[PDB]
C-alpha cells in the first residue's frame, strides 16, 4: 500500500488528512462532395445577397442574423395576399401597402425578372434566389404570388427606380 | 425597411428597456475620456442598437451614413484576401471573422492603418476613432494577442468597442484593459411592450395573449419576435388568440428531427436526419444555433431524469464542434449518442 | 585525387541499377532503349532519384552527343524572364544532328524556384519546338508547377521508398565496399532512413567512418536518434498501464535534452508499427495526434508528455 | 593579471583536454584533427554543454594566432546571414585559397537554427562543391530547424548534458582557482538543480559571490529563486491536509504575498508528485488533471480558477488516499 | 489643466514615497547614495508597486534629461521575439554611457533594463538575455520584474538577486482610493469603497481604474454598490444565490429558467465561473462536492476558452451542480 497509517521512521513523509480528520502518511523519497458544393454555392449566394444590400441596413445585422431571422419571415413579408386587379382600381390602403412592399424590396435589392422553362412557358423569379435559402423540401407548400402580381411588383420596382433617379435629379 | 429596421431607437434615451444602463453609458461617453468598451450579451438583446446609440451620442448625426469598403490584404503566404468593412467619417466596423484564420493579419495590418492614421478633421470629428470589431468571440486567439498591443499603444488615437456574445472566448488580457459593458436581453413584458408599441405605431390592434405568445416563442430574441409579428400581420390581419405563428422551417426541421428520433431509432432514420441536418448546414445556419435549437426542442420530450445528461452531451459536442473543422460529423455524433441514450431509456 | 562520398560515388549510371517504382523505371528503360521520349515532369519526395533517373535517361538517349544536345539548368542558375527567351529558345532553335528517335534534352532541375512568368513564357517554346527538342523537369512539390506546364508533359509521380528497395541498394553498396554488417544495424539504419536513399547512404558512411561495424548501438550512437527501443518499451508500458516505468523512460529521455517534437515524432512512428488491438491503436494514434497539436501550437514541457503517458494508460482501462 | 570578466568567460576550455563530459566525441574529433580528415560537422544538444567551446578550441588549435583571421569565418545570429551572405563572403571564402599559408579553412555559423530556408538550401552546393577547400560546422539547438539534406551532408554530433558523476572536478578546479569555501551540501545543490550543465554553475557561483560572498543553500535560494522544498511541502500540505477554504486562502496568501507562478508551482508540484508515493490510479488521475491545468494555463484562462482546480484535483484524492489506508 | 487618467497623477515621484516595501526602499536609496547595484528580481503580487518604485528610482538616478538615454523599460505592450531580444537589448546594452545631469545630481555609471511583465517570454527568449546581462554588466543593469517569480527559468533567476514584494493590507489601500475620490471632488460611501477594494482583491491599480470608470459611469454623482458590481461585471450575490436555490430545488425547469435568465441578463460566463467559485469556496460544501464543482468550473472555463457556447456550458455546469446539490437531498 502506498498510504501508511503509521508514520515512517527514517524516510521523509507528507501528511494527508481527509474531511473527517483522520491522519495518514506518504513517502517523500458521393454525398459529402455534392453537399460541400451545395454549401459553397449557397455561401456564394449569401455573399452576393449581402453585397447588394444598401450600407444603411447592412450594419444593422450580421449575415448570420439576417439569415436566421430576417430571411424566411422577410419572405413571408414579401408575399402578401394580392388580388389580380389593376393599379387604377386599387384602394388607397392597397397603394400604400404596395409602396411599402416596393420600398422594402428596394432596401434589400430584390427584383423580379423573367425566366424560361423547357415546357414552353415564361416564369417570374427574383434575381437573388432567396427561395432556396428559406424553404425546405419536407416543409408543406405555400401558395405563391400570381404572374400578374409579380409582374406588377417588377414594373413598380422599375418605375420606382426611375422615380428615385428623377428624385436624385431634382434634389441635385 | 422591415419591422426590425424601421423601428429601432435613435439615441440612448429612446430605448424601451434598460434605461438606467442607458443613463450610465450616457454619462460615460459625455466626458470624452471613455475607455475601450466590450459589449456582450445574448443575440437580439439590443447590443448593436446600443453601440449605434453610443456612436450617436459620441458623434453627430453623421454616424448613420455608412459606406462599404473593400480592402485586399496580403497574407504571409502571399495569397490576396478581400475583406468587406463598414466605414464612416467617425468610426469603422470590421468583421475579421470573415477572413477566418487570416483575421490576425486584419489585426496586424488593418488596425494599424486606422491607428497610425490621424484624424483629418479635429473640430467636427473628435479626438479619437471608434473601431467596432464585430463578433470578436469568433476571432482567433493569435488575433486577440495581436489586439492588446494595438489597443494600448494607440489609446489616444483609436478606441475599440468590441461587440460579442461570449466574453469567455475573449482572453482576459483584452478584458483587463477594456471596460465590460453588459447588455441584458429584454424580458417578456419588455418584448410585449415593444411589440405593442410597434403595432400601435402601425395603427394595428394587438391582443395581449398573442403578444405574449410571440414573446414566448422567440426565446427572448426581439428581432425574431418582431419579424414573426410582421409574419403574423401579413398571414392573417385579424389577430386571434390561437393564431398560428409562422414557425421557421429550421425550427420545423428540428421538430421533425426530434419526432423522427422519437418515432423510430434506426440507422436509416439516422441517415434521414443526416440529410435534414445537411440541408440545414447547406442553408448555412451556424451549427451552434442548430445545436441550441435541437436541445431546446429535444428536452421538451425527454423525461426529467434525462434532461441534464442530454444537455451536458450537447455542450460537449458543441465544444468538440468548435474545436474541430467539420461540423456534420460532430452533429451526427450528437444525434447518434442521443438516439442511443433514448434507446437505453425506453428499453429498460 | 580525393575519395567521393558514397552518395555520389554509387550514383547509378544505367537505369537497371535504379530501384523503387519499378513500373516507371521500366517505362523509362523502354524509352531509353527505343527513343522518342515525350515531355516528362517528375514529382515526388526528395532523395527518390528524380535527378538520377533524368540523368540516366538523358545519357542513354544521347550517348556521345551529351555536350551538344543537352542543356542543363538548376536552381543555381537564374532561369528568369531572360533565360527562357534568350537561352532556352535559341537551344530549341539550335540545329543538332541526332539519330532517329532522339531529341534535344533541356533538363530544368528544381522547377519550384522558377517564377510563374518564366513558366508562362516556356509554354510556346515547348509546344512549337517539340519536334526537335524535349523537356525533362524534376520538382519536389508539384503545386508550384503551373497547370499549362503540367498539361504539356507526361507527369510521373514517384512514391516514397520502401524498406526492401532501400535494402537491395544497401546490400549492393555493402558488397561493393566490403562493410561488415549485422541485421539489427540494417533495420535500424532503414528505420532512421524513413524512405530516403541519400540519408541512408550518408548514415551508412557515418557508421563505417565512425566505428566500421554495423550494429544497432553503433548507428544509434553515431546518428544520435532517440533510440526507438526505449520508445517501444514506453509504448509497451502504456499498454500495460504502468505510468511509473513509462515516466522513468520519459525522464531518462528528457534528462538527455531531447526536444518534445522529436520524442513525440518517434512515439508516433513507433505507435504506427506497434502490435496490439486495432481500435486501441486508433485511440492511441488519436491521443498522440491530440497531444502533438498541443506541442505544435507552442506549449511543450515534461508535464504535457506526462499527460500523454497518463492518457495512454487511461485508454487501456476505458473499454 | 586580474580581468573584469564573467566566470563563464574567465574560465574557458581553451584546449581539448579541459572539456569534461564528452570524452568519446573529443577523442574522435582529435583523431580527425591528427591525420587531417576533418569532415563537415553539425553540433547540437542542450544549450550550454560546450559546443562553441569545442569548435573554438579546434579552431585555435588547428590555426595559429597570427593566421586566425584568414582561416576562420565566424558568423553568428547578430550578423546578418541572408542569401546575399551565402553568395557573398561565404561563397568567396569557400572558392578562394589562403593568402598566407596553404591549408583548408573553417566556417562557423553560430545559432543557425534560426537561419532562413533559402540560405539553408543554398549552402548545400557550397558544402559539397568546396569540401576540399573548407569544411562547415553548423551548430544549432534543435535538429528539426534544418533541412534533412543539411542533416545528411554533415556528420551529426549531439553534445549531451554534463552528467553529475563527472562535472564535480571542474567545479573543484574553479573553486580552487577562486579560493572560495564550499561544503558538500552546497556541492549537492550545485550538482542537482543547475540545469544539468556546467554553463550555469560557474554563473551561479559568480552571482552568489557578487550578492553575498558565501555560497550556501540558504543564500542561493534567497538570491536565485526556485522555491525551497520546505515551501513546496507546505503548499502541498495545505492541499492534502486542510479543508478547501483554508487551503485555498493559505495558498492564495502565499501567491499574493510571495509572488509565485501557478505554472511553475505546477512544474515543481509535478516533480514532487513522482517523489510522493501516490497510488498508481491516483497518480494517473493527478497527472491527467495537472496536464489539463497546464494546457488550460497555456490559453487565456483565469489563473485563480486553475489554482482552485489544482487544489480540487488533490481534494478528490484526499478521501481516496485515506480510504485506501 | 485637463483631467489626467487618475492612475497616473498619484504615482510616487521618488523612492521615499513608496510605502511598506522597506527593504527594497533601503536598497534603492543605498543605490541612490552610490553603492553597487546588483541585478534585481522584483517579484510579488500585482498592484503593490513593482512599476512605480523602480520608475521613481530611475527618475532619481537620471532625471528627466537622461531618462531616454539610459533607462529601457520592456513590457508586453510591444513585440518581444527571440530576434528582438537578440538585437535591441544586446545593442542597447553595448551602448556607451554618456551625458551627465545638468542640475548637479550625480549620475550612476550604468544603464538600467527594467524587464516588466516577464512571464510572456519563452524559455529561449530569456535564454538569449543571459550573455547580454553578464557581458555588458559594466555598461548596463537588469531588473527582471514579474508578478510570478518561478516562471523565470533557474538560469536567469540565478543571474539576478531576489527582492520579495510585500502586499498591501486592506486599511492602507482603502485610504488611497479615499483620497483619490476626495481630490477628484467626487462622492462614494464606505460600503461601496469597501466592496470595491474587496472585489479588486489587492490590485490597487485595478481598484483605481474601477474608481475612474465608475466616476465616468456616474458622471459626478454618487457611486453606489450596484455601479460597483456593474463596473467589474460582478453578478449580484442573490443571483448567484438564485443559482444555488434553483439547484437546491432540483427542478430542471427552474434551472433552465435561471440559466436562460443569466444568459438573457448578459452576464459573462467567465465572471460567473469566478463568482460561483468564490461562493463555493466561501461556503460549507463537502470536499467531494466542492472538488467536483470546482473541477467542472475549470473544465467549463477551458471549453469557454476554446470557444464553446455560453448557454450549453452554463446549462451543463448548472445541471451538474444541481446534481451535486440534490445528491444528498
Ligand atoms: N532510387 C535510387 N536508386 C539508387 N540510388 C539512388 C536512388 N535515389 C537516390 N539515390 C542516390 O541518392 C543520390 C541523390 O538522389 P537525387 O536524385 O539527387 O534525389 P532527388 O530524387 O533528385 O531529389 P532532389 O529534389 O533532387 S534533392 C543519387 O545521386 C544516388 O546516389
Ligand atoms: N565541458 C566543459 N567543461 C568545462 N566548462 C564547460 C564545458 N562546457 C561548457 N563549459 C562552460 O560553459 C561556458 C559556455 O559554453 P558554450 O559552449 O559557450 O555553451 P554552448 O554549448 O555554445 O551553448 P549555447 O547554445 O551557445 S547557450 C564556457 O565558457 C565554459 O565556462
Ligand atoms: N508602495 C506604494 N507606494 C505608493 N503608492 C503605491 C504603492 N504601490 C502602489 N501604489 C499606487 O498604486 C498604483 C498601482 O501601482 P502599480 O505600480 O501600477 O502596480 P504594479 O506593481 O505595476 O502591479 P504589477 O505587479 O506590475 S501587475 C500606483 O500607480 C500608485 O498610485
Ligand atoms: N430598446 C429597443 N426598442 C425597440 N426595439 C429594440 C430595442 N432594442 C432592440 N430592439 C430591436 O431588437 C433587435 C435586436 O437586434 P440587435 O440590435 O442587432 O441586437 P443583437 O446585436 O444582439 O442581435 C433589433 O432589430 C431592434 O430593432
Ligand atoms: Mg535534383
Ligand atoms: Mg554560444
Ligand atoms: Mg503593473
Residue numbers in the entry:
A (entry chain A): 165 to 193, 721 to 863
B (entry chain E): 2 to 349
C (entry chain B): 33 to 351
D (entry chain C): 16 to 340
E (entry chain D): 35 to 363
What does the paper say about this structure?
State 1 represents CTF18-RFC before it encounters PCNA. Surprisingly, there is no density for either the AAA+ module or the collar domain of CTF18 in the apo CTF18-RFC state, while the densities of the AAA+ module and the collar domain of CTF18 are present in the other 3D maps when PCNA is bound to CTF18-RFC, suggesting that PCNA binding has stabilized the AAA+ module of CTF18. The largest subunit of clamp loaders is the A subunit, which is generally stable and contributes the largest binding interface with PCNA during the clamp opening process of all previously characterized clamp loaders. The uniquely mobile AAA+ module of CTF18 likely slows down the initial docking of CTF18-RFC with PCNA, and this may explain CTF18-RFC’s lower PCNA loading activity compared to RFC. Unique to the Ctf18-RFC clamp loader, both the collar and AAA+ module are flexible before CTF18-RFC encounters the closed PCNA. The low PCNA loading activity is likely an intrinsic property of CTF18-RFC, conferred by the high mobility of the AAA+ module and the collar domain of CTF18. The A subunit of clamp loaders (also the largest), such as Rfc1 of RFC and Rad24 of Rad24-RFC, provide the largest contact surfaces with their target clamps to drive clamp opening/loading and appear highly stable in RFC and Rad24-RFC. It is likely that a stable and preformed binding surface is more efficient for interaction with the clamp than a flexible and yet-to-be-formed surface. We propose that CTF18 has evolved a largely mobile architecture to lower its PCNA loading activity, possibly to target loading activity to the leading strand Pol ε to which it is tethered and/or to avoid competition with the canonical RFC clamp loader. Although CTF18 and RFC5 are separated by RFC2 in the CTF18-RFC complex, the CTF18 subunit projects the N-terminal β-hairpin across RFC2 to directly bind to the RFC5 collar domain. These strong interactions between CTF18 and RFC5 contribute to the CTF18-RFC stability.
CTF18-RFC, an alternative clamp loader, localizes to replication forks during the S phase and forms a complex with DNA polymerase ε (Polε). CTF18-RFC has recently emerged as a specific clamp loader for leading strand DNA synthesis. Proliferating cell nuclear antigen (PCNA) is the eukaryotic sliding clamp that functions as a hub protein and plays critical roles in many essential processes, including DNA replication, cell cycle control, nucleotide excision repair, break-induced replication, mismatch repair, and chromatin assembly. In this cryo-EM study, we reconstituted the human CTF18-RFC–DNA–PCNA complex in vitro and captured seven intermediate states in the PCNA loading cycle by CTF18-RFC, including an apo state of CTF18-RFC before it encounters a clamp, two states of CTF18-RFC bound to PCNA, and four states of CTF18-RFC and PCNA interacting with the 3′-ss/dsDNA junction.
